[PDB]
Amino acid sequence: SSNILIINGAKKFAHSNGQLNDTLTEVADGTLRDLGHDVRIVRADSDYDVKAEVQNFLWADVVIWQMPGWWMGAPWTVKKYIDDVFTEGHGTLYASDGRTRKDPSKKYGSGGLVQGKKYMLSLTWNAPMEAFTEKDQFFHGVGVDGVYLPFHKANQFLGMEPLPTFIANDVIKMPDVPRYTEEYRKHLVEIFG
Amino acid sequence: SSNILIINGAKKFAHSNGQLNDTLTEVADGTLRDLGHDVRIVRADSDYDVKAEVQNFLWADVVIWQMPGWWMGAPWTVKKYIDDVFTEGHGTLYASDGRTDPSKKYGSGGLVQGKKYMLSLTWNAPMEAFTEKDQFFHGVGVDGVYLPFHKANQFLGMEPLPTFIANDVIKMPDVPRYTEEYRKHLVEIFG
Ligand SMILES: Cc1cc2nc3c(=O)[nH]c(=O)nc-3n(C[C@H](O)[C@H](O)[C@H](O)COP(=O)(O)OP(=O)(O)OC[C@H]3O[C@@H](n4cnc5c(N)ncnc54)[C@H](O)[C@@H]3O)c2cc1C
Ligand SMILES: Cc1cc2nc3c(=O)[nH]c(=O)nc-3n(C[C@H](O)[C@H](O)[C@H](O)COP(=O)(O)OP(=O)(O)OC[C@H]3O[C@@H](n4cnc5c(N)ncnc54)[C@H](O)[C@@H]3O)c2cc1C
After folding, report:
1. How far is A7 from chain B (nearest CA, A)?
2. Using CB atoms, which residue from A76, A99, A137 is nearest to B83?
3. Which residues of chain A have a CB within 8 Å of the CB of B140?
4. Would you tell me which of A8, A77, A96, A182 could form a disulfide with A45, CB atoms 3.0–4.6 Å apart?
5. Record-annotated residues binding FAD (chain B)?
6. Measured between CB atoms, does A100 come within 8 Å of chain B?
7. 3-state SS, residue A124
8. What is the DSSP letter of B50?
């Protein structure tokens, strides 16, 4: 029975209507609450109160980033949420980068304050999965999490740890909702069940 | 004699005071134009006109991204520039992801093959954090942490040039050194 914060990065703009992400956010909200978890939802593309957002993070045991891939990553509004909130999070979400003369053992990234909290990515992309896995394709085979390395680290900088990522592919050419919904639903049950 | 578009991603906000990026922007400006290149500077954090920015791209042979490291990547303002400008460029900077027949893979529908791009970064993090196989960035390197940013540019058909980065710019600020390095870095590729 955990507190779950869903950050919906949905946003209507040039080809993206944000309907799929709103849907999946709704799928998470219902599935998660039915699994005994308390859920809070906030739209990145809104006029959020930065301090209240930080409070959402302190409240959350798990943070779920529901978002469409926009130019290989999170939409600018999602990045702004991070640049606004994590930064305001200084003193509560992180203390510094961790390095300290008092302990040469500590390296960059170890200054987080919320170790123990988890975060999970739920993505929607027009790109096929093979574009992520095939060693010879666009992403050199580094994988989805490879492509989202900097996003993962922004979160881990705070000390949070990742949960298995969920992604929907070819959402424009071969859209299939249901299925995305059913796979995400079972994905949530395996992790939060 | 090349056309060089520098995108200054400098932005105040919190502990970042865009002076370093502003300075490095001028450094590349002075150096490159001195080599005879035609240089144009645009600040990401401005009231840019997407159509005008698309034209700057078609005009440029090389695009330089001068920017600080913000939460592991480009500041939201620089990403907004991309989401706005690259998308506006559909039909000029890129056609699609390349897929139709069965052969062309994702990321091969660019329209500006032949153009180049380079990253000029500023981070608080030390270099070892990027290279140490067991440190924060599992040894993937700077270009690894910026893989997506690289790919956003490569989606348009553009190719990368060697990346320049200044590290520990807060704890161990060292201007000059960054300047001389960058200057020497620019002369190497554009000289
Ligand atoms: C600026 C920009 C940059 C982009 N960059 C990339 C990129 O780098 N890589 C990449 O792979 N993609 C990229 N995209 C595409 C983007 O990832 C997709 O457009 C987005 O993920 C679709 O999600 P959405 O929430 O906007 O849904 P929608 O726009 O609604 O699209 C989802 C599809 O599902 C259908 N649908 C949605 N909800 C339902 C429902 N409840 N029931 C039935 N059918 C439904 C819709 O009719 C639609 O065809 C980019 C898009 C933009 C605007
Ligand atoms: C929201 C946010 C998130 C961040 N996330 C990260 C992160 O994930 N990783 C990371 O490594 N860093 C991170 N940083 C730190 C950031 O990368 C640096 O603060 C930034 O790169 C410094 O560049 P600047 O242009 O803002 O210069 P400044 O803020 O001016 O800092 C550069 C230093 O150089 C000095 N200086 C500048 N210009 C000159 C000059 N012409 N002559 C002499 N001295 C000069 C300044 O006085 C200062 O001490 C983050 C910062 C913010 C605000």
Report:
1. 16
2. A76
3. 149
4. A77
5. 16-23, 69-72, 106, 122-125
6. no
7. strand
8. H
Task: Identify the residue whose tokens are 């978002």.
Answer: A67
Residue B124 contacts A, CB cutoff 8 Å: yes
Resolution of the deposited coordinates, in angstroms? 2.1
Nearest CA in chain A to B103: A137
Full set of structural domains in chain A with CATH: 1-193 (3.40.50.360)
**Amino acid in the structure at residue B53:** E
Q: Structure solved using which method?
A: X-ray
d(CA A106, CA A101): 9
Pocket test for ligand 1, best of A43, A126, A173, A185 (most atoms within 8 A of CB): A126
What is the 3 state secondary structure string of A127-154? CCCHHHHCCCCCCCCCCHHHHCHHHHHH
